[PDB]
Design a protein around this ligand. Structure first.
Ligand code: AV0
Ligand code: AV0
Ligand code: Y01
Ligand code: Y01
Ligand code: Y01
Ligand code: Y01
Ligand code: Y01
Ligand code: Y01
Ligand code: Y01
Ligand code: Y01
Ligand code: Y01
Ligand code: Y01
Ligand code: Y01
Ligand code: Y01
Ligand code: 6OE
Ligand code: NAG
Ligand code: NAG
Ligand code: NAG
Ligand code: CA
Ligand code: CA
Ligand code: NA
Ligand code: NA
Lengths: 151, 953
């Protein structure tokens, strides 16, 4: 009964930094910053990480992002038996996204299915908004982008 | 070489050298003072309102240093993150390394029959009252609240960027009674509701409020009811009451607590006295433009309703602006003190040069304070020293000018060196004592534990002493230059017809008062004065020592007032925050005191106690050990003994955080081993585990919690604390007490003494790895209250000791000194008893003014007391007439200038300015009357004669 998203749709149909979406960007977090203490590494066995960095940076996220991503992991495995949630970006130290991004403060995640079956991605973005992410965007054919409010 | 023979000859022969050297030193202090230090910051007014170096304060500083340093790759962590990283890498190597095979429209409630969220304390809000005193529950008042929000907030150019949204086309609706009426009867908006909708909504409120009062209604069941098409059954309450959570939200947020009393208003429509509106904009510095543009200069009413309270989160953000704007009132006080002094001195030169010295004393003290004494912090209440110095700085110039005029009259043939020498012999000590008594009363506040009180004492004490040095260097040189040159260098047509005649009339009218009228009234009615000022002394002593008393602060620190009580921001925190259910809950009506016990960290402050930004660094205890079998045994026994005490709240719901060693023992006893992967952690291990088995299995158990359960450990959670190498460096235990949170001093003292004494006694039994543990709780406000009481008693006792000891050295007579302290005691009881009747409490600035009352009160009694013993008359009546005539005018002028400077602070917005102005008026009235009538009546009746009571050298 749930409806998949369209190719460029975002569900709070307003810009990500709006108060009714993921709210204001606070500032870039780096390993020497005191706000780095507030990132948490996710170790949930229901999730696959593709950290191309090999630094583990994709596991690093804020507590609200960790809460929502674990609810999504349960939701994906419940929707399709034998399919896991996959992450290709968590917090990003590469700078590979934008001049301003919620990946730079650990409040955003770029995601796929375990199986990389692009036909499920519109339904994965639907499962994201049911799992309770504060903004969700079908950003590209390669991934869904999800983000959260600051704690 | 022709250097002058003496200091009196230096001032007489080379006064321009003295003014040159003073001016050079003053501009050097001014330049270095603005160039070298970082300037004062007033963006937080409550900065430094903290005890430092107290037992509770050092444990609260330590607990905050632990919370700042707990997290991923920090000094301390809740999780063994190196073990978690290695465990994840072990799974990657086992599987992932093969298994990852490769690489605007207004809101319409008929279309959108919902609010974007529930109301909360995070949103900007205003409180409305009726303009005509009516109930707010009427259609014109409901529409007035919507009209004010639309006109004052939503209209603002920045609101479109600040507002919450679901969609780019429109902002979310405001939470307001008219919008709840517009969902309950399905109108487009508040602007289209009708009297039947208001009446139907009131009938629903009257019907359903009994379930809100009985706790059966709640915020929950509409969520499931919105999902279901047919009916709701998540509650035993009537379905009409839950229709959008509307009745719960109206009662819990939008109406005052007395709108739907359990004694129900069945007889007539209830008196809704206050209502709240919430705007869909978050509180904070983003609200500054909306306030300053649309609310600041507004008169807060449309004639149907009035905005009585505002909570935009900007109270402290406006404080620095108003603090600096109100410096115009001290500037007007400077102008009036110049006017008084110019008429008194008959010289604009002596007057302007005196005021230059007063302002220079504050500049030179700022240089000494930041550059020589190296204070890194300047409290906002240091700006109040300007008002003090303007009022009291003048009070030596009047004395030195009188003594100069007496010296010129007594010895007309004298050399300028003789006139200076004789003037300084007669003036310089009396001027010092009145100054030093008041500096010492400010410096006595340096014994306070509270950083801002210590800082204000040093700054204000230093300005008073720097001003005295200028009154005996700069001012004598100015007086000599006036005599030498400007007694030649004197609308013009009327100056003799008006100005000079009026000055002569004022002179001789005043002089006849202080020579003839005032001595007559003091002496003729002396029995009336003795009875009256004794009866006032007993009345003031009863008001401060018996019933009522001065109370300790009653609001919690974050609610501290910083503006006049009429300001909407203050009316919010002190009047409306207690009247709405969502705010009452937030102050903690049901809250138990936590008993937190820490091991492995040292309870100490290694920061600078005079800098509020320097809280030092976290000190781990190297002698700590939890993993020893003796430590494991004793810490289990400690939890079980603490739970047998009358101070412990034994709830039925177990909390598996509270004593982590018990939860870990229970987890170990679950390990039903049938594989080697569990081997050390098996349930057959007896409880005092071998140290390596403890240190391993506690990591396995903590990560099993994190993987198994949707529950998270944060910097406040009880448990072990791991370092960067996953070794346990601290342990936190926490229990709930039977004691509740309260702002009452003796109840919070009872909790602290009962719990800290039991924990300290029990810790003396501990094995060596656990003997240095310490207890902490929500005690910051109790440590502030404790420090305010202690610091006031010590600073005031030190001030009274200085006041009596200088009295004896000023007048070498025990009887005069004793009548002076009896007059000063009466002055203080009447001054402080009046502040109690005005409703003052012993908060930060009020505490300081109590010791400063002592140092000020000395002034007029020492002046009349040295004039009594200077008197040539053999009889005590002649000695009193001499005292009153010779000092009456200068004392009256010193008092008047200080009263005038206080009166000018009354129009101020800032609370510290108005309170200090109230104090300056009141202490001058009481001090002047107790010196001029009561002390002089004691001298007239039984003042010493000949050598009686004289103290030998
Ligand atoms: C070392 C001393 C450190 C002292 C501590 C720190 C001082 C911080 C000062 C801050 C401060 C007050 C100045 C007070 C002067 C008295 C100081 C006494 C000190 C004695 C030791 C600087 O005020 C500034 O003063 C400048 C002149 O001095 C003035 O310059 C201008 O004129 C130049 C000449 O013609 C010219 O050349 C230049 O081009 C001009 O721009 C600035 O425009 C002005 O903003 C800020 O407040 C300003 O003034 C008012 C305040 O209540 C306040 O009034 C508002 O409300 C009233 C009531 O509701 C209402 O009636 C008023 O209508 C309304 O406007 C203003 O809104 C506010 O902005
Ligand atoms: C730094 C520690 C922090 C701990 C934080 C715990 C967070 C909560 C999860 C604790 C937990 C799972 C974790 C298990 C791993 C723990 C490893 C810890 C290792 C380090 C210490 C413990 O589950 C464990 O289960 C064991 C097996 O059943 C049991 O052992 C026994 O077995 C053997 C004889 O049969 C023998 O061997 C052993 O002796 C026995 O006792 C333990 O006693 C028990 O603690 C599940 O407990 C449940 O938690 C619920 C709320 O999540 C809580 O819900 C209620 O309260 C809520 C408000 O609180 C409220 O909202 C809910 O409405 C309300 O319903 C339940 O009431 C509670 O039951
Ligand atoms: C204003 C601040 C920043 C700098 C102050 C430094 C100088 C400008 C001062 C220090 C000592 C002063 C001098 C002290 C003594 C004298 C002798 C005095 O000689 C007289 O016989 C009086 C002559 C007269 O004016 O009638 C003339 C002024 C003069 C040079 C003074 C002028 C001003 C001086 C150089
Ligand atoms: C609303 C506010 C801004 C009005 C402020 C007005 C004051 C500046 C006026 C009102 C009455 C005046 C006073 C009237 C009489 C005298 C006595 C006068 O005494 C002498 O000249 C010395 C007499 C002696 O030799 O003993 C000194 C100034 C003083 C206090 C005047 C100073 C200026 C005062 C306080
Ligand atoms: C209130 C304080 C901060 C003002 C200080 C201002 C300064 C720049 C000094 C430098 C030279 C001083 C002036 C030197 C000479 C005179 C002439 C003097 O003329 C008279 O008619 C004196 C009458 C008398 O007092 O007996 C009046 C004061 C005045 C302007 C002085 C006032 C204070 C001045 C302007
Ligand atoms: C003249 C006597 C009474 C005081 C002698 C010491 C002064 C040189 C100090 C004390 C307070 C200081 C002021 C405190 C605050 C400000 C506000 C500041 O403007 C602000 O808006 C920024 C304040 C901030 O940093 O947040 C400009 C400098 C000023 C007037 C400071 C300039 C230097 C002052 C006057
Ligand atoms: C911050 C520091 C630099 C302040 C220094 C202050 C002193 C330079 C002043 C303060 C009061 C002055 C005294 C005030 C009164 C008198 C009495 C006066 O007459 C007598 O002593 C008469 C008998 C005699 O000459 O021996 C001589 C100057 C003297 C000692 C003054 C000398 C200089 C003193 C000590
Ligand atoms: C009212 C108290 C609590 C305030 C403290 C100050 C009082 C001690 C002052 C204020 C007004 C004064 C009164 C104002 C006027 C007069 C007229 C005066 O009339 C005379 O016949 C004597 C005048 C003279 O000697 O020429 C007698 C004193 C009296 C009652 C004064 C007594 C002293 C009073 C009560
Ligand atoms: C507020 C506390 C610190 C006061 C504690 C001491 C007082 C109770 C003592 C100190 C001085 C005493 C006074 C000293 C002088 C006099 C004048 C005396 O006058 C007469 O005897 C008038 C007739 C005459 O001239 O003989 C009457 C008692 C009285 C008020 C005394 C009453 C008791 C006093 C107030
Ligand atoms: C000695 C003469 C010259 C002057 C009078 C000095 C003291 C008797 C008075 C003046 C102000 C008083 C203080 C004003 C306020 C308080 C707060 C008060 O706080 C409490 O805890 C009261 C009880 C409670 O709140 O539960 C304790 C006493 C104390 C320090 C008072 C103690 C007695 C003081 C120092
Ligand atoms: C002559 C000297 C010793 C006294 C100075 C003149 C008097 C006229 C002053 C001194 C103290 C003042 C009083 C100090 C405190 C108050 C309490 C104030 O508030 C209350 O009565 C209501 C609040 C409360 O009682 O809790 C009303 C003014 C009043 C009586 C003041 C009226 C004017 C008084 C009597
Ligand atoms: C509580 C503190 C702030 C009191 C401060 C001192 C005042 C009580 C002094 C300051 C100036 C004094 C005034 C200065 C001049 C006069 C004129 C004087 O006139 C006469 O006696 C006329 C004589 C004649 O010429 O015939 C009457 C008292 C009065 C108002 C004085 C009354 C007492 C005043 C107001
Ligand atoms: C202020 C309190 C808390 C401590 C002090 C208590 C006593 C030591 C005081 C209270 C009243 C005082 C007395 C008040 C009045 C007088 C009259 C006075 O009589 C004389 O004969 C003066 C000289 C003369 O005229 O010949 C001598 C001092 C004496 C006994 C005083 C001495 C000190 C006394 C007993
Ligand atoms: C009780 C102790 C702890 C007090 C110590 C401090 C002061 C209060 C002492 C130190 C010296 C004492 C004085 C030493 C000598 C005398 C002279 C003595 O005789 C006279 O005044 C009469 C002389 C005459 O015959 O005219 C009366 C007590 C008095 C003033 C003493 C009063 C109390 C004083 C000031
Ligand atoms: C009757 C004097 C009583 C003074 C009591 C008092 O508060 O003293 C505080 C000190 C400052 O002490 P600090 O520890 O901050 O000094 C650090 C100096 N490097 O500052 C002073 O002692 C200033 C004295 C000189 C003033 C001109
Ligand atoms: C009010 O709500 C009802 C459904 O309860 C709907 O039929 C009606 O059209 C709404 N009113 C208006 C004016 O649209
Ligand atoms: C505020 O100003 C308005 C418009 O002049 C007026 O209707 C209202 O009565 C005023 N209220 C107050 C309290 O000044
Ligand atoms: C403990 O951690 C620190 C880094 O915080 C590291 O320098 C040290 O080498 C570690 N201890 C051991 C025994 O390696
Ligand atoms: Ca990555
Ligand atoms: Ca990356
Ligand atoms: Na004064
Ligand atoms: Na004094």
């Amino acid at each position: 009964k749930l409806t998949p998203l369209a190719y460029k749709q975002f569900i709070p149909n307003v810009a990500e930094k709006t108060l009714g979406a993921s709210g204001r960007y606070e500032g870039k977090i780096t390993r020497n910053s005191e706000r780095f203490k507030e990132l948490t590494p996710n170790y949930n066995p229901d999730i696959i990480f593709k950290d191309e960095e090999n630094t583990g940076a994709d596991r690093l996220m804020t507590q609200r992002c960790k809460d929502k991503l674990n609810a999504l992991a349960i939701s994906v495995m419940n929707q399709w038996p034998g399919v896991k949630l996959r992450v290709t970006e968590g917090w990003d130290e590469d700078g590979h996204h934008s001049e301003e991004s919620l990946h730079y403060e650990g409040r955003a995640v770029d995601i796929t299915t375990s199986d990389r079956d692009r036909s499920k991605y519109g339904m994965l973005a639907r499962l994201a908004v049911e799992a309770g992410f504060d903004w969700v965007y079908y950003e590209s054919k390669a991934h869904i982008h999800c983000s959260v409010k600051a704690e | 070489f022709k250097f002058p023979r003496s200091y009196a000859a230096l001032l007489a022969d080379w006064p321009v050298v003295v003014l040159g050297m003073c001016t050079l030193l003053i501009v050097v202090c001014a330049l270095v003072g603005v160039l070298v230090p970082e300037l004062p910051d007033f963006s937080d007014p409550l900065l430094g309102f903290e005890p430092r170096g107290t037992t509770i304060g050092q444990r609260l500083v330590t607990w905050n240093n632990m919370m700042r340093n707990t997290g991923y790759k920090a000094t301390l962590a809740n999780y063994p993150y190196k073990y978690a990283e290695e465990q994840a890498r072990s799974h990657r190597d086992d599987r992932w390394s093969d298994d990852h095979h490769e690489r605007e429209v207004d809101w319409n409630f008929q279309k959108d029959s919902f609010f974007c969220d529930v109301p909360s304390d995070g949103y900007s809000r205003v409180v409305f009252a009726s303009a005509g005193g009516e109930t707010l529950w009427n259609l014109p008042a409901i529409k007035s609240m919507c009209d004010v929000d639309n006109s004052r907030i939503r209209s603002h150019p920045q609101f479109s960027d600040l507002c919450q949204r679901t969609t780019a086309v429109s902002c979310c609706p405001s939470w307001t009674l008219g919008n709840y009426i517009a969902i309950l009867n399905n109108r487009s908006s508040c602007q289209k509701i009708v009297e039947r909708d208001v009446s139907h909504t009131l009938k629903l409120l009257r019907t359903c409020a009994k379930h809100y009062q009985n706790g059966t209604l709640g915020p929950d069941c509409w969520d499931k009811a919105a999902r279901r098409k047919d009916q709701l059954k998540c509650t035993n309450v009537p379905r009409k009451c839950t229709k959008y959570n509307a009745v719960y939200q109206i009662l819990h947020y939008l109406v005052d607590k007395d709108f739907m009393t359990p004694k129900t208003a069945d007889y007539a429509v209830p008196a809704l006295k206050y209502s709240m509106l919430f705007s869909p904009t978050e509180k904070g510095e983003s609200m500054m433009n909306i306030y300053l543009d649309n609310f600041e200069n507004w008169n807060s009413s449309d004639g149907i309703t009035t905005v009585t309270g505002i909570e935009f989160g900007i109270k402290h953000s406006l404080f620095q602006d108003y603090l600096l704007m109100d410096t115009v009132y001290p500037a007007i006080a400077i102008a009036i003190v110049l006017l008084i002094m110019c008429v008194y001195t008959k010289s604009m030169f002596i007057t302007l040069m005196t005021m230059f010295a007063i302002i220079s004393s504050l500049i030179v003290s700022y240089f000494l304070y930041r550059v020589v004494f190296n204070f890194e912090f300047f409290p906002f209440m240091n700006l109040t020293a300007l008002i003090i110095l303007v009022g009291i700085g003048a009070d030596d110039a009047f004395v030195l000018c009188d003594v100069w005029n007496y010296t010129k009259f007594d010895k007309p043939r004298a050399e300028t060196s003789e006139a200076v020498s004789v003037t300084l012999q007669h003036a310089a000590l009396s001027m010092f004592v009145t100054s030093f008594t008041t500096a010492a009363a400010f410096y006595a506040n340096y014994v306070s534990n509270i950083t801002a009180i210590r800082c204000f004492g040093v700054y204000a004490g230093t300005a008073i002493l720097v001003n005295y040095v200028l009154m005996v260097t700069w001012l004598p040189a100015v007086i000599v230059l006036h005599e030498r040159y400007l007694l030649n260098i004197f609308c013009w047509a009327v100056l003799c017809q008006k100005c000079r005649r009026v000055l002569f009339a004022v002179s001789e009218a005043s002089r006849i008062f202080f020579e003839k009228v005032l001595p007559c009234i003091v002496i003729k009615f002396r029995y009336l004065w003795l009875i009256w000022f004794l009866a006032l002394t007993v009345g003031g002593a009863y008001i401060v020592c018996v019933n009522p008393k001065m109370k300790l602060p009653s609001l919690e620190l974050s609610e501290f007032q910083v503006f006049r009580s009429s300001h909407p921001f203050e009316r919010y925190d002190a009047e409306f925050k207690k009247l709405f259910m969502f705010e009452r809950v937030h102050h903690g009506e049901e809250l138990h005191m936590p008993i937190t016990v820490i091991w492995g960290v040292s309870p100490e402050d290694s920061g600078d106690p005079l800098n509020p930004k320097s809280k030092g660094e976290l000190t781990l205890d190297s002698t700590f050990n939890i993993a020893s079998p003796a430590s494991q045994a004793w810490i289990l026994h400690f939890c079980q003994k603490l739970r047998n005490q009358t101070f412990f709240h034994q709830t039925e719901q177990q909390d598996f955080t509270s004593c982590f060693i018990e939860t870990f023992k229970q987890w170990m006893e679950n390990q039903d081993c049938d594989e080697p992967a569990l081997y050390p952690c098996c349930s057959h291990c007896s409880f005092p585990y071998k140290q390596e088995v403890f240190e391993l299995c506690i990591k396995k158990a903590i990560m099993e919690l994190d993987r198994s359960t949707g529950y998270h450990l944060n910097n406040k959670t009880p448990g072990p604390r791991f370092d960067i190498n996953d070794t346990i460096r601290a342990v936190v235990l926490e229990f709930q007490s039977t004691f509740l949170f309260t702002l009452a001093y003796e109840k919070m003292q009872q909790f602290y003494k009962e719990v800290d004494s039991w924990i300290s006694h029990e810790l003396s039994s501990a094995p060596e790895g656990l003997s240095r543990g310490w207890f902490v709780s929500n005690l910051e406000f109790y440590d502030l209250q404790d420090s305010l009481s202690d610091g006031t008693l010590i600073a005031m006792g030190l001030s009274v000791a200085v006041a009596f000891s200088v009295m004896l050295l000023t007048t070498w007579n025990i009887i005069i000194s004793l009548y002076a302290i009896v007059s000063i005691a009466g002055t203080i009881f009447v001054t402080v008893g009046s502040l109690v009747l005005l409703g003052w409490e012993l908060n930060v600035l009020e505490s300081v003014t109590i010791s400063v009352a002592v140092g000020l009160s000395v002034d007029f009694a020492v002046h009349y007391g040295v004039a009594y013993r200077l008197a040539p008359d053999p009889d005590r009546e002649g000695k009193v007439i001499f005292s009153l005539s010779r000092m009456g005018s200068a004392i009256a002028m010193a008092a008047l200038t200080t009263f005038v400077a206080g009166a000018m602070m009354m129009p101020s917005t800032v609370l510290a300015y108005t309170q200090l102005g109230t104090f300056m008026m009141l202490v001058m009235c009481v001090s002047w009357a107790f010196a001029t009538f009561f002390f002089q009546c004691l001298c007239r009746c039984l003042g010493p004669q000949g050598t009686c009571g004289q103290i030998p050298f």
